From Swiss-Prot:
Organismal lineage: Viruses, Riboviria, Orthornavirae, Kitrinoviricota, Flasuviricetes
Species whose genome carries this gene: Zika virus
Sites annotated Involved in NS3 ATPase and RTPase activities: 267, 270
Residues the record lists as N6-acetyllysine modifications: 200
Superkingdom of this protein's organism: Viruses
Domain Helicase C-terminal positions: 143-322
Functional description taken from the UniProt entry: Displays three enzymatic activities: serine protease, NTPase and RNA helicase. NS3 serine protease, in association with NS2B, performs its autocleavage and cleaves the polyprotein at dibasic sites in the cytoplasm: C-prM, NS2A-NS2B, NS2B-NS3, NS3-NS4A, NS4A-2K and NS4B-NS5. NS3 RNA helicase binds RNA and unwinds dsRNA in the 3' to 5' direction. Leads to translation arrest when expressed ex vivo. Disrupts host centrosome organization in a CEP63-dependent manner to degrade host TBK1 and inhibits innate immune response. Inhibits the integrated stress response (ISR) in the infected cell.
Section of the entire sequence shown: 1683 to 2115 of 3419
Protein name per UniProt: Serine protease NS3
Sequence ranges assigned to domain Helicase ATP-binding in this UniProt record: 1-148
Binding of ATP, residues: 10-17
Amino acid sequence: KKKQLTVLDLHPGAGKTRRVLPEIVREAIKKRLRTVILAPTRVVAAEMEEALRGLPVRYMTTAVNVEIVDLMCHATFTSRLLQPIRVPNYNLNIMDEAHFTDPSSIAARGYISTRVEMGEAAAIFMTATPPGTRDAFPDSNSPIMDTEVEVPERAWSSGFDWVTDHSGKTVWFVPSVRNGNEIAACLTKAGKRVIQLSRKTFETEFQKTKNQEWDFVITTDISEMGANFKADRVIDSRRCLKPVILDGERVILAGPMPVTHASAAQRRGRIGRNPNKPGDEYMYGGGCAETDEGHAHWLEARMLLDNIYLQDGLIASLYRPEADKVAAIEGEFKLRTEQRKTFVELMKRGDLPVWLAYQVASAGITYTDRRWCFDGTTNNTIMEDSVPAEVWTKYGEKRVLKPRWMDARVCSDHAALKSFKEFAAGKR
Ligand SMILES: Nc1ncnc2c1ncn2[C@@H]1O[C@H](COP(=O)(O)OP(=O)(O)O)[C@@H](O)[C@H]1O
Ligand SMILES: [Mn+2]
C-alpha cells in the first residue's frame, strides 16, 4: 500500500530473498505497480535472477545474462538519480540487504523513505539488522556455537592453534585489506589455501569460492551484504576502519575499532544457515560499539542526497533511524548543474571517494584538471614504500603525490594507491 514503508527484518536465512521477495514481485505485477528491486552488489543481483527466475523483471546490470519490475544495484539507482537520466517514480521500492552502509545505499534509503513520507510511494527494506539493532546474536536456521576469543590481527607462530587445527572451511572478517594480506600470507605458509575478498575485487574473486578448493576466505566488511558461503566457521575480529573527517579538511581511516551490533550479527549470520547442519561456530575477537556515529559514509550520503532532485527546492532527508549519525546542514552540499556533473564524474569515472570528489567539484575544478593532486601541503604527501609517491603528470613532469585535499582511502592499500596515481597522472 502507498505511504507504507515496511521493514522486513526476519532473522538471517529466514527466506527474505529467496521466498518472500518472489511473492512480493508477483503481487506487484498483479497490482501493476511500477517496482524497483535494489540489490547490494552485482554478485547478489545474479543470485536474485535465480530466485526470481520466470518472472518478468528487467535486469539493469550486465551481471545477469538474460517488464514493469526493474532490478538494479543500490549504487546504480543513486547514480541514475544524480545524473540527467530519467528514473521512474517507482510506486514500490524494494531494497534488499538494506543494512548496507555504502554512501549510495544510505542515500537511496533517504530518497526512498522521503518519497514514502510525501505519500508518493511504498517501500520495503529487507534486512535482518535494521538501523539501531542492538542484538549481535540473532536467531539462525541452526544453532551457532558462539565463543569470545583473542583473534590474531597480525602474523602469528604460537598461541592460536585453534585457528589452524580446524578441518572445515572458515570465513574470517579482518579489519583492513592490509591486515588481511598479512593473515593470508601467514595461513598460506601454514599450508592453508586462502582466498582474499575486498570491495574492489569481490565479483572476480568471489567466484573462486565456488571454483577452487579453499580453507579460508579472508574478507573485509563487503561480505556482510548477501555473500553466501559453504563454510562451517566464521572468525570475526569484530574490528573495522572508520573513515572520519578531521577538522573539516581531511579524511583519516581511524581505528581499527569495534563494529556495530548489526555488522557483527551480519558477519556471524554467514553461518548457521543450514537447518540440517548444526554445529557451525562463530569466534569473535572483541565487543561491539555504535561506530557508525560520525562515520564519513553518512556525511557522504548527505552530499549525494543534497544533489538529487526531489521536488522544486526540497531535499530528501536521511532515513529517520540513521539520520542522527551525521551532523550536517540540509542542502549545504547542493551543487549547481555543472559542478554537480563534475562531482558525479569524479565519483564514477574518477573512482574517487564521495567526500574527496565533493571537495574538488565544489572548488570549481573541472574533471580532467589534476593540478590539485600535486599542490597540497607537505603534510599531505602520500607515501609508497616509506618514500614519497611519485607519478609523471600528463605534462611529462615527475612530481610528488601531494593532493590539496587528503583522503586516506585513496592510498589505504596497494591497489587504491595504484588507482590514485593513475588518476593524478591523467590516465582516466
Ligand atoms: N542457491 C541456493 N540453493 C538452495 N538454498 C539456498 C540457496 N541460496 C541460499 N539458500 C538457502 O535458502 C535459505 C533462505 O535464504 P535467503 O532467502 O537468502 O535468507 P535471508 O534473505 O532471509 O537471509 C537459507 O537457508 C539459505 O542458506
Ligand atoms: Mn537476503
